[PDB]
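#dry-run=false #mode=assembly
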Amino acid sequence: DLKDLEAHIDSANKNRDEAIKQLRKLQAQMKDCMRELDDTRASREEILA
Amino acid sequence: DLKDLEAHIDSANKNRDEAIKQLRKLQAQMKDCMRELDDTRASREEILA
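#status=ok
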């Protein structure tokens, strides 16, 4: 049980890394989309107008 | 130590929940920006023409 919980801790930490890894990639992707959406909405709305 | 491992699993799972909670709010914003960019892509590509 100790080794099972120890291995489970690695799986729990590994599972947390998966969600954290996606958050890191999603954050970089969201920031790029948010930054682009800011310049695009500020430029496209002006260039299209 | 077995009971102590449960705290690490709870703490590790708690940290993953925090990242998942923040990722959920950020993942939704990323998809929202893509929708505006997609709508602006066709418009900027056609309105500019």
